[PDB]
Amino acid sequence: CGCMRVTYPDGQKPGQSDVEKD
């Protein structure tokens, strides 16, 4: 939550998207 989007180490690096809520 908050106006951020850190993400998890989804494998490592799917384009430098990753999954998270906030």
Side-chain angles (χ1 to χ4, degrees):
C1 51
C3 299
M4 290 185 178
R5 182 56 68 92
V6 180
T7 69
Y8 297 153
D10 289 352
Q12 286 195 6
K13 203 59 60 238
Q16 195 40 74
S17 195
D18 24 265
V19 79
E20 235 279 341
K21 36 166 179 44
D22 64 357

